[PDB]
Structure formats: C-alpha cells, structure tokens
Design a protein around this nucleic acid. Structure first.
Ligand SMILES: [Mg+2]
Ligand SMILES: [Mg+2]
Ligand SMILES: [Mg+2]
Ligand SMILES: [Mg+2]
Ligand SMILES: [Mg+2]
Ligand SMILES: [Mg+2]
Ligand SMILES: [Mg+2]
Ligand SMILES: [Mg+2]
Ligand SMILES: [Mg+2]
Ligand SMILES: [Mg+2]
Ligand SMILES: [Mg+2]
Ligand SMILES: [Mg+2]
Ligand SMILES: [Mg+2]
Lengths: 234, 109, 122, 226, 51, 129
RNA sequence: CGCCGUCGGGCCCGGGGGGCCACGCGCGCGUCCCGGGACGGCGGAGCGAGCGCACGGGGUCGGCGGCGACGUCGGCUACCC
RNA sequence: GAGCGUCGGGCCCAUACCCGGCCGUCGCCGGCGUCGAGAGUGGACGGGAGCGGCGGCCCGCCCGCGGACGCUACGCCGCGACGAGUAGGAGGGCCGCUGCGGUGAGCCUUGAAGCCUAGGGCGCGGGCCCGGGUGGAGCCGCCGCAGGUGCAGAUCUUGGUG
C-alpha cells in the first residue's frame, strides 16, 4: 500500500544504516589490525636491542680487561620428568601449584627467591632451565592452549586473547609473547591464561630420568640446555 | 621374459618380548643389509602370493589357484635393513619364513 | 491448555507404539508419524492432516473447523482433491501458506501428499 | 590489459612491500499469449517450473569446506630425471619392462611413452609416471615434430551396449576388440619415421631397445644405477 | 588448530608482521648469497689467473 | 537392489565377537550369556593378559549408525496393515519386518501393501505355500 | 677533560642509495624547526564500485580412471581345522 | 668378549606421553525467532538551521504467489577436560519371568506356547527380533500395579546318566 511504499523510499535510508553498521566494524578491525602490525615492529626492534645489549656490554668489559656477569635470568621453563605413583607428601602439593599434575606437561615459572626454594623441594621430579626466545616463540604458537571459563581452547586467533586477556593491554598474540618473555608487571595473569603445555615424549630419548643433570643424567637444573630438550618434546 | 620383482623373506610380526602386535609385518629383505641402505624401498607394494583349492583371479582371464594378500612398506626397522610392511589384511603366520615379493611397481627413481 | 493436553498424552496414550525403535504417533489426524508436540493432531486447535481417498483416486485433506470446539462431529471439515499431481501439489500449498492456518508443518503436509499419490498412481 | 605486475619468489609472497605495491599501481592519483478466440490476454509462461513428486525424506546440504579443486583443474608435476628423450621402462603393463621411449608429458599428468613399434610390441601407448623408472640413457628428441592432434580425448576406451539387461554374447563390446587401428596406423608411422633416424645414431641402441628387463640373479635394485 | 610456523596465512591471522618478518629474511639471504658467488667467481678465477 | 536407503556410511563396530561368560566352554551348566564374574581371585575381573574380555562402554557403537541393518535401514516390527502404514512418511530410512506369528492368510496382504508404499520388508518371501 | 659503543633518545641539524600497513594541492587550527613538515581537531578533504580473479584462509573432493558371468562374487557368525 | 669397567652414536617397545577416530561420565552451555521476512553491544520524532547526494531550470515488495531439516522440552544441539577398582553406596535398563486393571478395532487350527537350529542379524551388555524344522491351542506388546521373580557353588534337596 501507500504506507509500505513510503517505507521503501525510506529503505534506501535503512540500508544506509545497514551499510554504516557493517562499515565501522570493518574499520575498527582494520585499524585494530594495523595496530598489531606496528607493535610487532616495536618488539622486533626491541628483542634485537635486548639481545645485542648483552653482547655489547660484555665486549666493552673484556676490552678493558674486566669480567661482565649477566643478570641471573628471571624466567625458567619447567617440564615434569617423573610420574604420579609414589609421591612424597611435600612434593604432592608443590607440583599442583606449578600446574604439573600429569607427566610431560609444563609451564613457565617466574623465577624469584620464593620460587627457587620450591624448585629444590621438587628437584627429582622436574627438569628446568632458562629458555631462549626461539623456544617461547614456538610454544605459544604451536602449543598455545588457553582456558576461558574452564575448557582449554586452542588459541587460533587474536580475538581470543583480546577478550580473555587484553584487560591490561595485551590484545594480540605477540603482546602475549613479550609479557611472557620479558617478565613485566602482568606476567601473573598471562601465565594463568595459558593451560599447561602438554608436550610429547622426547625424540632422542632421555638419560636415566632420576639423577641430577650434574650427574650426567637428566633431572634438575640445566640453564640453557633445556632449549636442547624443548626441540625434542615439541 | 624374466623376473620384475625383488625377493625378500618374511620374518615375523612387530612384536615385543611378551606381547605381539600382529597387524604389522617385518621383512628381512634380500640385498639390503643396512639401515642406511633402505632409503629406496620405502613405499613399495608387497604381495604375499599363496595357493588354495578354489579359484580367484585378476585380468589374466582364466580362474586360477593363485591368491594374493596385498600391502606396502612403511618404514625401516633396526639397523640391519629389516623393514616393516603393513598389509591390508594381516598375515596367516603360516608364512613365517616363506616369501613375499617386493615389487618395483611404485617407482621413485 | 493444549500443553496441558500434551503433558498428559505425551506418554500413556492409546495407539502409541514403542517397539524396537522410536515411538510412533499412529493418530487419526497427523502428517508425519512421530509422537511429538508439533506433529500431534488431537491437541491443537488448528490441525492439518491428509488421508487416502476411499473413492480410489485422489487425496483428501482434513482440517479442524476452529469455530466449535468440544463438538467432535462438526469439528472436522474435509475436502478431496483429485488433480494432475502438480496442481494438487500447489493447492495444498495455497491452503496452508496463504492463510495463518499452521504455517508450521507446511512441507510435512506436502511430503505425505507427495507420497500418497505415488502409492496410488500405479 | 596488464599482467600481474608482481613477480613471485616464495609461494604466496610478492617481491615488493605493501606500501611500494601501492605506488607501483600509481594509487596516489586514482582514488575513484492468446493464440485463439475467447481468451483473456497474455498467458505468462513459467520459466523453470515447479517439481511434482517430493521424495519423502530429504538430506541436508554439504558445508563447502574449501577450494578442493576437481581433477581437471589440479596441477601437473613430473620427476626431474624424466626429461623428453628418455628411454623409460614400463613396470606394470602387459608390456611390463620393455625399454620404451619417452616423448612428452600429456595434459593429464600421464606420459605418452612411445614404444618404437618396429622394435617392441609397444605402439604410442600411454603410461603413468610413477609406475615407470627413469633411465639415464638419452635420445635427442627436442628438434622432433610432434603431432598436434593427440591428447587425452584420443587415447581413451569407449563403451556401447544395445540392451540394458543380460543377453547371450559378452556385451558386444568386451568381446570384439578395438579397431581404431585403421586410423592409428598412420599416426604411428608418421612417428617412427621421424624417430628411428635418431635411434640409429647411438651405435648399440636399437638392440638395447629390442631387449627386455629382468632382475636376474644377484642384481638387487637400489645398487643398480639407471 | 592448523599449525603456525609450518604454513603461512595462519601466521598472518595471528601475526600480520610475519609477512614482513619473513620477506626480509628471503631478501637478506638471497642478496647475501649472491654477493658471495659474486666474490667466489672473482676469487676462484683470479686464483685461476694466479695459478 | 531392493530399495536403496539414504546416507548410511561404512559400518565399523569395534568388536564382532559377542562376549562370553568366563568358563562357558568348560561346562554346559554355564550358559553363554555374560554375567559379571565377582571372585576375589578371578583373573578376568583382574583383567590379566591372555584371558577373556569384560565389556565396558568403550565398545559403544557410533551414535550416527547405531542399530544398523547392513542395507542401511533400521528395523521396525509390525503385525497388520494399520501398523504398517505408519512408515508412509519415514520409509526410506526404516524398514518393516513381519512378525513370526502373522499367518500366510495375512502375510500375503502385508507384503502386498509394502509394495505400493515402497517400504523395505525384511522377511518378504517367508511362509509361502 | 676527552676516550670506547652495527649504543640508545623514531632526537634535532645543514647541505649533498636502499627502504617505509606512507599519499591534497588548492593554503590554515594549534605547537614545533629556521615557509615546509607532523598532527589531537577541521581549514585540506581519503572524488566507493567492490566489479572481478587467486587462494598454504573456519577438519577432502574429483565436473578422474580402470578390470571380471552362467560356477563363479561378496559375507558374517556359540561349524571345523 | 656374548665377562667386568669407563663411555659414544644408533636402534628396539608399555594400555604411559603427543596427535586423530569413537563411546560414556562430569562441568560449562545453547535453540519455544519454524522469523523467507526477522536482523537490536543503542533505537523514534515535527519541529529552528544545514551540507555529502538523489530530480536546478540557483525550487521530494511481489515477470515469478516462492524457500529444505528441526523442538518426545524427560526432545535436540554445541564446546571442553575426563575414565582403574575389592568391601560398599547410589543411578539409569525399550533386560527377563509371573499375576492384575488399562490399551493395542494387536495376534493366531491358513498353526499360539514351548523346544531344537553349520540359517540371517541387532545391542557394549543384560537379552531380543527374523528364517527353517518339530509340535497342535492359546499368546504377546505398550502405560500403570503386584511379586514366594533371575544360579555354578551351600560335604545343596530330590530326580537322572556316566
Ligand atoms: Mg615408582
Ligand atoms: Mg629414532
Ligand atoms: Mg635408558
Ligand atoms: Mg545346577
Ligand atoms: Mg585378591
Ligand atoms: Mg569405573
Ligand atoms: Mg514381550
Ligand atoms: Mg518377552
Ligand atoms: Mg507367586
Ligand atoms: Mg525365593
Ligand atoms: Mg557364586
Ligand atoms: Mg555341592
Ligand atoms: Mg557311578
């Protein structure tokens, strides 16, 4: 009738509203995508800077005949070695707190003097050492599983990290890498965001699983050689 | 006129000390006597040929007493060039020590 | 109170068959056979059913009158259709869609009207 | 028209950056009826009419998944050692092992591997790439004319049967053989005349091609070098 | 979950800069390599000119 | 060849052996029905290797194709014509099956109606004269 | 005080190749450098149609092909070996 | 060295660990929008002034009569981690037997019960349905109700045969 034909003249105004609504959604997420492009530029400038600083600091120390010692690294990757049956009461509780409840799954651990004395208590049950950037670069990408209510969801996208974790300013995946790698002020809630890294059994085989890595075996601290192991278990 | 398949011997199943796993064969393959030497046979079709009193055939027209289980090589095993072989349907275990033809049908030269 | 009638009859009715599989409704007015809420034809005020033709050829269609409830002699009005398998496909589409009379269960009326002619034509 | 302006270096990476490909396209300046008596008017036809019988239970629709690309539109890849002018070896044929001259890669990914018909049984029979073995020994073929016509539509087997159910003779198609050989008799003799003067050059070759191939006693493969 | 670091275009949906991170690496490697064969054809021919 | 049902795929069943009672073979007073062995020594309850298998819900078949006659349909019993017409709508996924007590006076009539409606009937040529 | 640093601060700077998710002159809204440049806003004004194709992109499709009868084809079980 | 010791590179396999299929349990959920016409992380107005642009002469549904499947609400769908078990406790059973109201316009001397069965299957399972053979007169489903209701065992009772 004359009233509905009056709205079909007004429908060209209506689909302008349909155009406009799809439109700002397009140009949010476009300029929200341009943001993620330049924050990674800033990090790729940054990790080059922090890496080459430790070379550049040491090289002008050795020139003047003086030892450089680096800061004791503040982030350790921990993977569990042994099993479940036959577990002491004191180490029962501790491996719960480090999210290592089954075998061969692991997390990151904020190193600190409160956290160091945990890792003496569970010395036979874990293998641990300071990672590299390349190791963390692989784990969040290949084995990134994150929980939201419960229910670990594979990451697969930056919208998952925008809602569940970007309360502080870490909306995308490379912000998650910087906060994990350089321990900042929000490492706690980024580390709680990740589910434990359910790795594989190692490729080459371990070495005796029980003695310390000082004793030639495999348990305990190893300080860079866990980069050698995390290529196997990934 | 002549032979187009290479000879190999069947040796047993991919087993443990106590339990077997019957669904994957093992082949002692003639000529190959090294882990490193079997980069060639990975992916060739085996054929276990056997005799039985009824008649089943193939495009050779006339019905024959010749029956065949197919299957193909997966990966190498051990260091002596012993080689696994997953058939479609499994072995009879009559055939331990008998012969499975290793073909040249699939070619990667 | 149609849902009152459903919450009584959805089990413990008569002509309900539970053998080897799903329930079946087997009710005198229904298109599909399921004991369901939507394909249930004693309950609703507005029901659509098609049947065979005891004349031998054709499809008869059953609709409830909606004027007088609780008066089951006069509560049904029926009409037969014997056409050329395509016009009797559209006429049942016209009578369902071009009224408010159950726009739900359009297709199930038709698929039965589809199926019952092919049982009947050869 | 223009081609794609952007060379490829690694699979799905253009050679130039995003802001420079903006300025290679000059994108700083191009921001844009009756037929009778007693009858009332034009009978509107119905294009694409309505269907009569509805089958009494329909299936739902597939979910489209991706760009899986059916077999006509895939890709063609051949082993590096099987260059044109190679003496291939059949394995799986009725010919099975004869040393058969490779010519060229057809459009289907199969290979048109001509047996020198005087030397073998093998005509211009087509064979598959992975069932044949490359051999290092070569014939020059690069300056040889090929027929234009021969392609996959020419080399296929065709079927015809007159009744639908059974009868007394074997299909009248699988009993009587193929007699395209009236036609193909010319295409082959147009080939082997063009080929055999190349074969004559290697002074032991046409005996080698007459031969067959057999794994004789202790000649294991993988230590044979083709 | 299709795997990053093995296919591209799942890297990009997580990390659009991984295009520019990797396209630099190819032009690093191809330019640095060509400059070696440039000198290697110079240094082996000059030592073919010297010996 | 008969009526060709809808989409019904490859049928795996995880075990085709039908679990036997522990020591059904030794006796004939132990009937081949499964009953849970509840000994305080028993090896099968203890699940040794080389013994027989207890059932558990790990053998539960695929819910998409549970209860599958091998043609594709699913069976449904019937005794007369009024119970047969109830698959006039759902015929190409469920099949009828005439019960063992229907007489040949009536079995000829039920399989007569099954022809016209196109319903698969799985004992069609049974109890002929 | 100089000295060392593929330092850093997008420093700036004054002339004289690579590269960059980088594109308004016509002149104005502020700062800045000794007029351009950068912008939060407007004074410039992204002068939209996505129209097409590719697709390492939200779990495979072939719009690929063969070969076999009147005693042979497939098959599962509380059948035997 | 096929012994002992200190070792290196391989290689072998557990129901363990990774990835994939499947069942079930648990948690956290979803659809009464069956809405081919609903589209709302913001939506109506008539005013007083405006330009980006539809018409400047610088002034205002329907060629098609059409569109799959769903939803027993105790139905279905989705995503995720989980599974050992004596004594024991709960839950679900379209598991079985026997009797009673209800229903199946059920069933059958044109062959019911039973029983046997190298016959065809279904269920994880309890157990069932189907064919054939025997016999010759009654029997079973579904919703409820009621049990003197489910055997390998008791130096089991009685019967029967080695
Ligand atoms: Mg222990
Ligand atoms: Mg290894
Ligand atoms: Mg060891
Ligand atoms: Mg007894
Ligand atoms: Mg005990
Ligand atoms: Mg349990
Ligand atoms: Mg019963
Ligand atoms: Mg019963
Ligand atoms: Mg009693
Ligand atoms: Mg009692
Ligand atoms: Mg007992
Ligand atoms: Mg006793
Ligand atoms: Mg005696």
């Amino acid at each position: 009738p004359e009233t509905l034909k009056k709205k079909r003249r007004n429908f060209a105004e209506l689909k302008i509203k349909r155009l406009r609504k799809k439109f700002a959604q397009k140009m949010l997420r476009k300029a929200r995508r341009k943001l993620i492009y330049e924050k990674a530029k800033h990090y790729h400038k940054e990790y080059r800077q922090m890496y080459r600083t430790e070379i550049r600091m040491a090289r002008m120390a050795r020139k003047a005949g003086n030892f450089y010692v680096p800061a004791e690294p503040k982030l350790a990757f921990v993977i569990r070695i042994r099993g479940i049956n036959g577990v002491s009461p004191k180490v029962r509780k501790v491996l719960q707190l480090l999210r290592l409840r089954q075998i061969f799954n692991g997390t990151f651990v904020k190193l600190n003097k409160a956290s160091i004395n945990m890792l003496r208590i569970v010395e036979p049950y874990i293998a641990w050492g300071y990672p590299n950037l390349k190791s963390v670069n692989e784990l969040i990408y290949k084995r990134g599983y994150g929980k939201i209510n419960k229910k670990r969801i594979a990451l697969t996208d930056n919208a998952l990290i925008a809602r569940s974790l970007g309360k502080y300013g870490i909306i995308c995946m490379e912000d998650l890498i910087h906060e994990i790698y350089t321990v900042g002020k929000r490492f706690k809630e980024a580390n709680n965001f990740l589910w434990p890294f359910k790795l594989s059994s190692p490729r080459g085989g371990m070495k005796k699983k029980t003695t310390h890595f000082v004793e030639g075996g495999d348990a305990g601290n190893r300080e860079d050689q866990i980069n050698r192991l995390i290529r196997r278990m990934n | 006129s002549g032979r187009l398949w290479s000879k190999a011997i069947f040796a047993g199943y991919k087993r443990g000390l106590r339990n077997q796993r019957e669904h994957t064969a093992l082949l002692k393959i003639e000529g190959v006597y090294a882990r490193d030497e079997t980069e060639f046979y990975l992916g060739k079709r085996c054929a276990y040929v056997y005799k039985a009193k009824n008649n089943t055939v193939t495009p050779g027209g006339k019905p024959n007493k010749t029956r065949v289980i197919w299957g193909k090589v997966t990966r190498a095993h051990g260091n002596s060039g012993m080689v696994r072989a997953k058939f479609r349907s499994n072995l009879p275990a009559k055939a331990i020590g008998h012969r499975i033809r290793v073909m040249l049908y699939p070619s990667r030269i | 109170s149609a849902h009152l009638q459903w919450m009584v009859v959805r089990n413990c009715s008569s002509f309900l068959i539970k053998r080897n599989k799903q329930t079946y409704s087997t009710e005198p007015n229904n298109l599909k056979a399921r004991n369901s809420f939507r394909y249930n034809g004693l309950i609703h005020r507005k029901t659509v059913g098609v049947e065979p033709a005891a004349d031998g050829k054709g499809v008869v269609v059953v609709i409830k009158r909606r004027s007088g409830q609780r008066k089951p002699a006069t509560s049904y009005v029926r009409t037969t259709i014997n056409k050329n398998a395509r016009a009797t496909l559209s006429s049942i589409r016209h009578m369902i869609r071009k009224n408010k009379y159950r726009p739900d269960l359009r297709m199930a009326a038709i698929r039965r009207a589809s199926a019952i002619l092919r049982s009947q034509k050869p | 028209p223009h081609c794609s302006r952007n060379p490829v270096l690694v699979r799905g990476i253009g050679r130039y950056s995003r802001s420079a490909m903006y300025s290679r396209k000059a994108m700083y300046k191009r921001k844009y009826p009756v037929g009778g008596d007693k009858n009332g008017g034009t009978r509107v036809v119905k294009l694409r009419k309505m269907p009569r019988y509805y089958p009494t239970e329909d299936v739902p629709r597939k979910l489209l998944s991706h760009g899986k690309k059916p077999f006509s539109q895939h890709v063609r890849k051949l082993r590096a050692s099987i260059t044109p002018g190679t003496i291939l070896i059949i394995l799986t044929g009725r010919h099975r092992g004869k040393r058969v001259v490779f010519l060229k890669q057809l459009a289907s990914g199969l290979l048109l591997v001509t047996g020198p018909l005087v030397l073998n049984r093998v005509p211009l029979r087509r064979t598959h790439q992975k069932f044949v073995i490359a051999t290092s020994t070569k014939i020059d073929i690069s300056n040889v004319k090929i027929p234009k016509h021969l392609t996959d539509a020419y080399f296929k087997k065709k079927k015809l049967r007159k009744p639908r159910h059974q009868e007394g003779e074997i299909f009248d198609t699988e009993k009587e053989k193929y007699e395209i050989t009236e036609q193909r008799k010319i295409d082959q003799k147009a080939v082997d005349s063009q080929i055999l003067p190349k074969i004559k050059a290697i002074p032991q070759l046409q005996g080698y091609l007459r031969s067959v191939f057999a794994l004789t006693n202790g000649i294991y493969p993988h230590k044979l070098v083709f | 979950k299709k795997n990053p670091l093995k296919n591209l275009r799942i890297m990009l949906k997580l990390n659009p800069y991984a295009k520019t991170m990797r396209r630099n690496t190819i032009l690093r490697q191809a330019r640095n390599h060509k400059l070696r064969v440039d000198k290697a054809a110079a240094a082996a021919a000059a030592l073919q000119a010297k010996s | 060849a008969a009526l060709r049902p809808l989409v019904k795929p490859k049928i795996v069943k995880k075990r085709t052996k039908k679990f036997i009672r522990h020591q059904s073979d030794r006796y004939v007073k132990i009937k081949r029905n499964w009953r849970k062995p509840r000994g305080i020594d028993n090896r099968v309850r203890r699940r040794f290797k080389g013994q027989i298998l207890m059932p558990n819900i790990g053998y539960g078949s695929n819910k998409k194709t549970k209860h599958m006659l091998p043609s594709g349909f699913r069976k449904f019993l019937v005794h007369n014509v009024k119970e047969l017409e109830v698959l006039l709508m759902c015929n190409k996924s469920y099949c009828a099956e005439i019960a063992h007590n229907v007489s040949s006076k009536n079995r000829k009539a039920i399989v007569e109606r099954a022809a016209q409606l196109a319903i698969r009937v799985t004992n069609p040529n049974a109890r002929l004269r």
